[PDB]
Amino acid sequence: EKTHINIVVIGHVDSGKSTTTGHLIYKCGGIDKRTIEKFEKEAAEMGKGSFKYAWVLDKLKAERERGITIDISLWKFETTKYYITIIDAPGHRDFIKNMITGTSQADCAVLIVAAGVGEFEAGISKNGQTREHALLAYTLGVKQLIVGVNKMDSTEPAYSEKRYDEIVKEVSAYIKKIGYNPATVPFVPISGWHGDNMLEPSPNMPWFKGWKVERKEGNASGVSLLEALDTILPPTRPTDKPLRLPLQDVYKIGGIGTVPVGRVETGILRPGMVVTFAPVNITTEVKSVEMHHEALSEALPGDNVGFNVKNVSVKDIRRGNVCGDSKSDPPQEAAQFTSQVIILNHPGQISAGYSPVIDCHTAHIACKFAELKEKIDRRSGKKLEDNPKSLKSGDAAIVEMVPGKPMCVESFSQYPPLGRFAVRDMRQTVAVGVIKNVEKKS
């Protein structure tokens, strides 16, 4: 019973994602050497060129398409502390969508960054994907980030400390601005190609004594990339987060009173708690909690429960309101929210003002796309334009949104089940999205 970990590999195109990932798979014995060859030969037939290592990540991306997993046993490998699985990487039709719909869900993002001359500079430029990729992971609340500083073999000189330092520094400042805390991220210099420093230290890099993480949960340190992999913190576990319980229904049960029903998404609900309902802003005390027609002292995450509340009318709270704890990040009305969406098969064209209904947790409310803030390439996460005038089917984007009626939502990283939504026009699912920030009301 080692715990399961999900890894997403990101980084700018040609920075070395498939190479590194494939090498790692090879070196960890997840596939037998015979079977590694079948797929090497097979890849060569299929494409012009050599696919040693890379075929692994390429097969993976391709097996995350249209919406069937048939097998993922090749992508599972064992470290000392975890069973790790590679989930997905940028560079295919569905990447953004898999990320956004949670069909591909990750506990950590390995961000590959290329150290070769001009390579790092391209990834981090206006045409590069390094920032976007980091930004995307953060948005999806992947709070564990490892940075693999790759192709060290081909710096100027080979394996330059100075170059490693320069990348660690510049990349640290960006991931800071973005919201990660740099000190928690292992910056590991490596060569995906030769293998340097993936499983043990490399004779080529004697100047490198190792990396140090400092987190809330305590310090850790190592040399290789395997060791970084094993300092990954697990989630954060819903039970330990403040209460969030979106309202499915509200009944008036005779000689008992108002009884809201819902799934505890995060936190504990218990009889006694004085809870708050957003966005109606009403605080009151839970007389009791029922599940399977039986009193509960605790309602845990995943529990569907009735709870009787004193002094509230059935007309005061409704489906889609959100209940939480009044003395622990009580829920609030969303004045507006910023999100990342991928537009699926629409009719035509969307502009500031478009107001479809947003289905989020148990709410169903029309929201205005106030500002269209970025268009984003769905294959790659690459940003393709600031304030685009209009979006259309196939685009990913970043949009600002203003709820038409009062609504309560949460950012996807704080409260996932309250941070993912679908966008709807009649029976049309036009978009799916996740919520970056939310401006709370007063």
Ligand X SMILES: Nc1nc2c(ncn2[C@@H]2O[C@H](COP(=O)(O)OP(=O)(O)O)[C@@H](O)[C@H]2O)c(=O)[nH]1
| Backbone discontinuities in the chain, residue before each (C to N > 2.5 A) | none
The Cα 79–Cα 171 span in angstroms is: 27
The distance of closest approach from Cβ of residue 345 to a second copy in the complex, given in angstroms and rounded to an integer, is 7
Q: Kindly state whether residue 421 participates in binding a second copy, applying the rule CB under 8 A.
A: yes
Stretch that binds a second copy, among 133-141, 325-333, 369-377, 420-428 (CB under 8 A): 420-428
Using CB under 6 A as the binding rule, the residues of this chain from 41 to 70 that contact ligand X are 54, 57
Residue type at 345?
N
Beta carbon nearer to Mg ion, 10 or 309: 10
Provide the token pair at 27.
């070196």
Stretch that binds ligand X, among 132-140, 149-157, 359-367, 426-434 (CB under 6 A): 149-157
Q: Kindly state whether residue 34 participates in binding a second copy, applying the rule CB under 8 A.
A: yes
Binding site annotation covers 193?
yes
Binding site annotation covers 98?
no
Phi, psi of 247 (to 5 degrees): -85, 115
Q: Kindly state whether residue 375 participates in binding ligand X, applying the rule CB under 6 A.
A: no
Binding site annotation covers 19?
yes
Phi, psi of 153 (to 5 degrees): -60, -20
Provide the token pair at 21.
């990932």
The distance of closest approach from Cβ of residue 48 to a second copy in the complex, given in angstroms and rounded to an integer, is 12
Nearest to 187 by CA among 104, 127, 120, 95: 120
- Which one of residues 123, 148, 192, 417 is an interface residue with ligand X (CB under 6 A)? 192
CB contact burial 276-305 (16+ within 10 A = b; e otherwise)? bbbbbbbebebbbbbeeeeebeebbbebeb
Positions in the binding site for Mg ion (CB under 5 A): 14
Residue 280 CB contacts under 8 Å (≥ 6 apart), including other chains: 316, 317, 321, 406
Phi, psi of 359 (to 5 degrees): -95, 115
| Residue ranges binding ligand X (CB under 6 A) | 11, 13-19, 54, 57, 150-151, 153-154, 191-193
Binding stretches for a second copy (CB under 8 A): 1-2, 30-32, 34-35, 38, 46, 58-59, 61-63, 65-68, 70-71, 73-74, 92, 97, 101, 103, 248-252, 263, 292, 304, 314-315, 318-319, 344-345, 359-362, 420-422, 424, 426-429, 432
Known binding positions for GTP:
14-19, 150-151, 153, 191-193
